[model samples]
Target: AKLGAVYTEGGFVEGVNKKLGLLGDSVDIFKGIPFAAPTKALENPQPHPGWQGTLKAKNFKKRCLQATITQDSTYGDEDCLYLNIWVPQGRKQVSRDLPVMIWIYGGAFLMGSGHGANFLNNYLYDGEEIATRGNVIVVTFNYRVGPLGFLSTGDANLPGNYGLRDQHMAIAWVKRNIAAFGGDPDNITLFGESAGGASVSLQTLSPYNKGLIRRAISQSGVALSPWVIQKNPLFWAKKVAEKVGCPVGDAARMAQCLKVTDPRALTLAYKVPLAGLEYPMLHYVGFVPVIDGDFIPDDPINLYANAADIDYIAGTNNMDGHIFASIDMPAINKGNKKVTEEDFYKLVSEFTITKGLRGAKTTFDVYTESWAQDPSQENKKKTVVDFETDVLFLVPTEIALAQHRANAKSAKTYAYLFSHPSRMPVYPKWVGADHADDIQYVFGKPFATPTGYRPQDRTVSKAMIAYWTNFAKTGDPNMGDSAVPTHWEPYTTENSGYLEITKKMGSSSMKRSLRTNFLRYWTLTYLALPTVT
Candidate 1:
């Protein structure tokens, strides 16, 4: 067997090793490489038996089975435990010790692919530019989703968190085989957006990642996000079981019934009716990562101290919560409907009640009275967006950062705020930097398609790619060569410093006190409230 070739647990493997052109640069791409065996329903991922011959890693594999977001359709395969790799220098060994960055796609833990969609002929996760520009190896892969990936019975009958387990298995496989593909196995950075971001924090906190991950970056979401961890898996599992006509009483029997159910039928079980009522806060997906005493051993909020060895970075877009409140809540900012004080109260009360916290009056007063004092329709709408942003994305990440800083001994933690508004003309003025808007820049999409994006957009994208890749290489975003030099300060509990990533790419952007007042309302005032339960 060749020593420096693409060898794996599954015998000898072969990548294209051919020069593939991106816009101007070239990268060697190896797609659809299997990392694990075909996983079973509601179970942990199984190891792949070594393939007999040299496996040709060519085309992208089908994504995990999931219901479409808006198309009213479903498409994917059960045997979708595969990954892709992109190496710089077009297969020629320029460097075998390059830092490796593994990306996890986010779809609320419902839909998304490592081989991201081809929007306007641009594959979302195509790592050619990042690999070439950053001089690093890039990898992305598929994981089980929907009920198949998460639906736990809260016991051994169905220990759930299969999606997170799939990620773990892929990371383990990369640790074993990445060195052969021009990557440093010891210097791996796990990064993701939204639920993928949450999974990054979750994965880093897990005891399993002792030596597998060195640095971690969560773009928008974190393990502390309300929607990331399903607190009551048995209740949701039984709900899913009821949807597919399975036994709801017995956990083991229900698990068996789900195992034998058709894969498509099982996947679509996430569509359980919500009776036209929006979910409390932004917890859209019915099935999500669970504390199964394995992949996610405990509540992630308590697990951050355990990740003292991992260098961490977590952040959110300026208006990360806009997409949800604007789209999902019929009573809120939809079309010409003017947002009212009552509309604001309804949302805050619902959230407070759902969390069983006794701070509805104070929470409402803090956001509306302090922020939207004018009582105008426009200010009220902004208030709603801000409240949603703090609850759903901002405060959770802030709390996580604070905890990491509090407990960390040797490891460093940093934070950022992507304040650059969307350049896409379709976005309204109100949709500041909506959820996952920073992903394109992180992957260098503006550089790939120059004409489609503004010059300022490209500038921001270049800096993001540099910061991300540099962090991957040295566990610090400021240590390497960057297109735009900015000193990104480490976030501490006292300083609460975070780099505001805007079109302005310089030291001035590294400001402090990101949403400090709002953060206090949630973390200090709101948290101090007595429980209604």
Candidate 2:
């Protein structure tokens, strides 16, 4: 071997433990621990061999490979099934039975890592404070993405959900080894944002993960989103095979060809057709979780109505659709073309009308009233963003919440709407609660003097961390040590209570705040929303 390193089926892929005394306590950190063995395209995940010796658990590993939408390319890796663990303790260690939190990163089912880069102006996800301050162990890990992760044929040869299974395996690894890290495996809380959030919700519907998860917090996404389920997975599977110039037609044979294919080549093979993606739903056309009658069985929402059993906190930022909005994209909004009302109807017609759902005339009529639209294309851009925001995040979340609450017998369910804008200068002010704004608040930025948020931002951040940590401990966001004010009432039992998460956190009637009649007219009733192909 060129690098004196023998890649073998032995010793642990470990490193030294982390120590952070500044946050009032010390934490033992381990990075890049493999939870599963190396796998090929389309194959189900298998357990790691469990290395013999103590491997140094220091540096992070390569993120799962994928095609990037904007900026630098992702580092491709085949053997990238790894995890990071953060443990709060001292020399002799006053270790108690601590709650465990597992993070699943969301990236449109394309690319995400267990630990993202410079998450809090640090190298990456800085979990030291989370462990020390919250008195809970934190775990985050990478799962497969792109074609290799979700390619499905809906048969025994390839049942799909390799990425989902990867998450389940990671949780199992925590259940088996978290005791060594001073964590109570039985009290684990799984949480995530966007696609990651959807995955958390999906796991609750899975039989394999029944007792493994005690609680879940799904942010900005849910399993019921039209975009999450690949209704025509085999079609895309064939398209991917054709794109890679491999054996086509037969699902099993095509998968065998993928098994021996290059990982990068395999990733690029499932390139989403952006031309068809003039909206949020279509962006997920090529790559998504499929409805194979095994793990997922069917639509999660339909199943969640009376079956899924897990205490959960499901929410979305007010402007979460900004992340998925197409009209606001530089390419679409280029030349700063003011989106006129006529243009709005034209664009909606181009995308939605042909699908044979309600026409632009009806949609425009319903949205223009209290929505307060204007004629300028620029202002109209806000129109598209706001409508899609409700369609993509809020509406689906409410539906899922309704389902969860319908049968939830004491299993508490909470909902929140993050109305605060991003503190970063680059983010435009017009877009409220734009995508992932809650992340910085949820994770907190303790020492980033450079990007460290201002006073109000920090206050909100502290409250968010407190709320989240509090939830992990007691399954209730208010009962724990977090000093976050206001009673966060459950969103179902009594006409639904939605907590408006701002510097001045308050509550609202879900039906009234979301304008129930208005939303039902637009999205929920009659299956009015068009399906993503």
Candidate 3:
């Protein structure tokens, strides 16, 4: 066994910290620690059988089987339930009682892993810098994804959110065993991006997380996000059952058959068919979390509004929905075709279909009137980006924050808007902080990279790490870190205050409200209108 051997409930893990010159500090990293027994299809993960000898926790484990977004293929295995831990070893070689932050990776409930190695050589998800710089414990773990993690029969036989269950088990495992790695078991903060962001938010609402989670940071998603809760688990589960030639009528029969079906066949069963639609892709997340009475008790909105125990920080990037725009309207984004007023009306109508056809015109008027004076294709596309952002990310996040604050009992609640524009020239200038752009900064990528990021980008990364780690350490972002750039005010029903994170420190100051007029229409006015019959 190598140095820095730690004994966990599962067994002894042996690994040494790698002192990366880039990070300028040593971080003891233990990788591939089995958190749970291998998961079966459509079932929860069981307790790890526990190893006898010293486990060489020095390498990443296999990712859960799932279809990839870059290619139309499936990769990984069923036996892929492992976690990694990064502990900051300061100059003295021993650190204790540090706040722990567990990250749940997001791939839209489809694909992604704790290692995050598909691109950029695994640096994208590395927690070395975050552990060292923040002087905190960092953990990332792989959970089942795609159909394997979320296929649900919508009943007790196959109640879904297996992925969410995996996360809960991991959190529970950390609470039990993280003390061996020098982490504060009572001070665990769960945070993540995109679907992962929504996972943490949902985790807080779950009765299972009552004492397991102390705080939560939802980067760009929440329970209220239109795509977070799978509205029809049985529909998607039956779709997979039919694709894999399993019985879909009886829930028990289908669950048993799915348990033995080829996992890959189950994975590729349901592709997101709403990718390039003129409508919003909100309802098309085929396999995601469900209102299974266990992991999730009620409607996510109700769960969120009633949740008040955990300290919370939730917000969205400036233009999180621009990615949807670029994918769905390639011709408009590429200048091959200009957006016409007719096209605008049709798209808005489709996007607001859930709000009812009666409210679609009003929603369209509110979004399009600004561009009416000069409705160039560029301006029109910008409005589409704003509408998508509101529906997919911002409005849902704002509402979740409001609910968390309104229902607060003892925990502190805060919010922020990551407004730093992406330095990548690939995206249009208007696509400010496109979805998941804040991830790199949260992981302190700008500081580790040799180049590409500007000086301002690195500065923003420092402030973000300070703010996030500070919040994790002490419920309040402003309480723990003297270096935090600005005072982040808490969000309330009355004062819609939130810190605006940006490249410049002064400009990244607090703001009283965010898109009040737009929020009122979506959160209040639109719901009051009649449905199209």
Candidate 4:
């Protein structure tokens, strides 16, 4: 039988065989198509067999191997490598070359898939309004997650970072097959939020992925973030092995034993001490991407700092801590306990002072002064949030922007700050514009009706879509619609200006002191210090 073509909008037929139903029409959506073989505890991803027949591309595959969320069971399989594609509803003539936007979802490198209901069919190509406005194709896929994805055995044979390799495989698949679905293989833009954003950042520096992707957008995440590079795969793997009762003395033996152990037992062993300091260990288990010599040559930031010549847009949220702060709200509200100056000093002593006079004083001074004036419980909690946001998101993002700008690579780089507050009540009202709130706007979805999107939100969304789509079409985002007047300036170590996207979007140049202070403190103390485990 001849291969079938699916039709959508203007009699455009996607040459794939799978049938899809979207907005009263049928289209093809490939599900669980293997682009790479199961890494299966290996350091790199290998190619999978190519399908000869008109393979059905419909539903999304299960997310890559993850820890179980239910009553203690392993959540995913080692053979969980898969990717999904969403071609526009139409067939392309030989000359018709549609732009492709590949999405990388974020769940802290441990969870998320392209097919989640909340995420699927919501981006520019998926929605009619956006799709019609900008004729483009969308693609999303799953990479290994958690321990299955990032366990660094520290051994040359078993090294780590298989998850990143899986992503590269998926991109290769797109380069080879997207043209069949009406997408221009050469014109691809990679974008994602949080961890996904970080992945895009790393892809920029990876030699293996250099030409596969042309443009990139990183929202609320940066590759230079301390967490991305600070992860010691060998250290993490050893701790995880201990928790799971595997002998950590020899990496090969542990891998062999883990291969046969019940997935449930492995999950239970990791989750038992989840809330303790070991929590970091269990939580990060099998989730972090490693600095394997092959997939990642050196620290990604170092590479970008030296010379990363890829068109890029990267930024972070203004109210980053609101999400985590909301989770800690009950404990915060219940407190009548005030944090006195003495208490502040004590905390500094325990967390900083004990580390000795090397870099402790700088961090101590900053932490003390940031909270010095306020002895109230409310102020104390706010202080913690401020610190967490700076340490985890802001500092790292700024560092990345600075390094990229400093490199003066052949690519153009732009930065932005997402500060629009959502009106929806589902999120804590006090959370402000927390992390992930900007997702709907980036994807161009309707905000919850109760908290309608601000006029600025709509305007900003259009501008972002234009910028993003333009980047996908060309290496530069500036080629898009100019009707929306937003000047996106290239970031520089000297100017340090970033576009602020809020109800009101504009550009502001920052001071060197403002950008470097937090970065210095974070690097000297938390990041440079070895993990206590």
Candidate 5:
């Protein structure tokens, strides 16, 4: 129930407001609206069987079952394909066709949902700012993740990419029903950070969802990223089958046998990171998108060539690798003096476990010489951070952007490199603009920054809101904006123009894509061993 009600095509559902601040003002916020029927585990989503009466859009339904990341906590039920919407009250929902922005949460494809967990009214992925501030319709939904979602054994019984399919169903739900909420279905912009970013890019690559979506804003993640594709997914499928006492030899029998097993048991035992890698010692995620010949068709880099031209804003933070670093932060925070070459190689191997020592050595050779002269242990730490940053986010993002730019026949491509450091006190100084650092600011966190922002932080935060909101409405971020950050230009193979999103007026300088230096190292290292980290 709510202080009011909105009429949807399905029925009259309830609405409420997120009492986030002093204004005591908000939108006709609708939460936990089921977009699709929560069907069987490992099955693609289907449209919900419509309810006959008005549904109470009050509580946030549980999310898809998943394991936590480096933490011992968990949430969600199997039937968890719900979406929420925020439509401003003062704004005209009947006339002004607000552009739609749907957020897809990322968790290495193993976890995360749009249902933000609030702590004293602070939670990551809050879309209220982007909604009200930008005057756009913001939508967020939950999709299946981890074992319950990505169990691909190639057993016809085991449908792969359940999570992605869930997203497709949600978008379809929006397309069919968002008009009731005053959003422009034809001009919807798919946006997300990290794994969510990958989902946005994946939709662009997918042949199934062309007309349903328009532009995409992919931050810090893309389908082309090395970690996105699951290799030999069946091997782990069988490994998980055995762990749960299912007959491993019979693929169909195994899938059926495991279907009845507990969701929590499946997540912890089967989808544990690196659980099946070398059957013991390992690295990388357990459940992630796979190149299923039908849906995904091919790798994202290859698919980008054939994909339709969809305008996009894609990039990573200067220190994004901080989120992917193989090393624990505690030891570094203790102020380790120097990063020895031995430990450097060891850290690389640990991060990319299946890649082994030779793979680690190849990476070591690249960073060793530069690191050797650095007397400061902190300098060594920074070098490692730089290596991980480039190899993972920076280079992969450029690869996707380059591929898309060369092939895009429609609107121009826009790229960025977020260098603005996080204002959260929890982050260590070495982390730089830690991964997803732009998120709080992007979603409108005027209060979340515990360590108050510098003048530059506020300036950049304001600019980011303008830039992102602008992109969501029109294809270009600079369109019709008299604001001076209007310097943001469409990216080109020649101009290589990308905006450096930072604080300070005019600090968001236009820069070229570093395909030569950053991607060169990645290409060379990848050539050494295509599967290496």
Candidate 6:
């Protein structure tokens, strides 16, 4: 019981709890707690309160000023709304409520942190493992990255994603302080990865996140992906408030002169120096999460194609677009250089398909037959990352399983396809089974291997930690024993049943690939869509 270390005033908290045995008793572990408030221009993420006494949880916070297209500017901070917790040992005086999971770190909202070193909650809470094998209560947070948490201030005095209202104020401060750390504020389970799994698919269709969260696990970004909604956050917040001169036809005096400027001069006046306006304006500012008829009233794949009772488990990773199309390929071959197959059948006849050019010659013959059966010459220079993962993750995960089987909704949707195969050495030596390679077997970690273990990768990491802790304990990720393996159905546009975990974990029954010819040649003639641009 001796890992001990703590510090505040916003940084460094190392009680790795005796390297996570969670040392002697009452484990509190709070770190950078402010669940919102501080973001000013066009203000959105606002609550925060809670800390009056005994605040030092320990280490890591500042990550909001975003826009780090590489040149690593050690995380960020426009006072990035924080969160981190790990409770287990002596379940906060055994009133034992438990069951809360939170976590949300992914980067493609531009970089991550819940105190990185690969999001350390001592590898899923210490006290002897998976937080005592699911006694639960392990959270992680940090939102507002890139274009300052999705910058779109079309100026209703500052309106944009605000990094999904700082993850709905860190799940309303873990439903009012995770039962002082024993948890169970109505059994939460908002998982993430990849734009925090596209902000848990826009907080499972947020009505400003109703009922905070009940159960959801979107591994490779879902919310019927087209880069998880966004058809204009006031036209990219009037092009990032006219590139920082704060010009928005007086939207509350341009958010009070960009909220009294100087947050590193409002992050170097929205930094654009074009490379597509510096990663969509000072770092990926195509500003996602917006359909905002009122915190996303529609288009989350048409609200799961209009059923919306929501209980999900979406997946992907079998080269989830070979790491952003092997880093640009001369700007996707100069936007697929001057077409010609008769201007690519007149750009696939301005798409809406209906067998045009035999669906643009069957999506250019399945990307030249998955790039000549890919024997990796860096995945044949990532044909625009397999045409942007068939228009962002396989046609938005087959239009969210055909809008949850066209809204029949009794709620229970599970789909998988990890395609295993990774003993490290990622990057293009056949980027097969790509995208966040199932985050170290769904957080069992330790895959930098040295001949330590490998019995079928520890039986697919204990069958993916018993199918994601039995879908965070009963939202049904199956595993009802019988040595695990059940019918695992329900994903219907007429039987699109999934589950393909890999290295061998079957179930396919198959159906998805609606001859729209890879979404009419990658979302209508190679716009190369991933939530647009």
Query: Total clashing residue pairs per candidate?
Result: 0, 13, 0, 10, 1, 14
> What C-alpha lDDT does candidate 3 achieve relative to the native structure?
0.83
lDDT tens digits by residue: candidate 2, 1-533: 00111132434444345455444346667888888998666777897876765676787887777676641344658688888877777656457578899988888888878876453347545576677667788899888988878887767666789899999989888887776566888889998888888898888778777678888899988997656788777777787778787787677888788777777777877544544344435444557788787888777866773334578899988777765565334322444445555655655554354345365556666666634334544455665776667767787888888779887865788888888765442225464577877776676663333255667777777777888888899988887866766777777645576777877665431323565765576545336555434
Instruction: Residues 464-530, candidate 5: write the lDDT tens digits.
Output: 8788878878887876232436468888778877888876436438877564664776566644574
**Model 3, range 121-205, lDDT digits (tens) per residue?**
4457788878877878899999998888988888887888899989999999999999988899999999999999999899999
Worst 10 residues of 6 by lDDT: 276-285
Ranking by TM-score: 3, 1, 5, 2, 4, 6
Candidate 4 to native Cα RMSD, angstroms: 5.5
| C-alpha lDDT score of every prediction, in listed order | 0.81, 0.71, 0.83, 0.62, 0.73, 0.59
Give Cα distance to truth, residue 397, candidate 4, Å.
Answer: 1.1
Best of the candidates, lDDT: 3
Q: Estimate each model's TM-score.
A: 0.93, 0.87, 0.94, 0.81, 0.88, 0.33
Q: Write the per-residue lDDT of candidate 1 for residues 1-533, one digit (tens) a residue.
A: 11224567787776765445543335567889889998777767899988887877789999998887642667988889999998886333256788999999998888888886576668989888788788888999999988888888888998888899899999999999998777999999999999999989899999887889888999999999888888778888887788899999899999999988887878777564443365553545668888877767788877876788888999999888876776545445444666677767777887787445358888877877645454645566676777778888899999999988888887789999998876442225564577889988898888888877888888888888998888888888987645446788888877889999988777688888876888877887777777776
> Candidate 1 — worst ten consecutive residues by lDDT sum?
423-432
Q: What's model 4's lDDT at 266?
A: 44
In candidate 6, residue 408 scores what lDDT?
45
Off by over 4 Å in 3: 1-3, 20-25, 117-121, 273-279, 424-431, 529-533
* Alpha-carbon RMSD of each model: 2.9, 5.0, 2.5, 5.5, 3.9, 19.2
lDDT for 199 in candidate 6 is 81
Cα deviation at 107, candidate 5, in Å, is 1.5
Q: How close to the true structure is residue 394 of candidate 5, measured as C-alpha lDDT?
A: 80
The prediction achieving the highest TM-score against the true structure is 3
Predict model 4's lDDT versus the native: 0.62
Looking at model 5, the pairs that clash are 337-377
Local error of candidate 6 at residue 255 (angstroms): 6.5
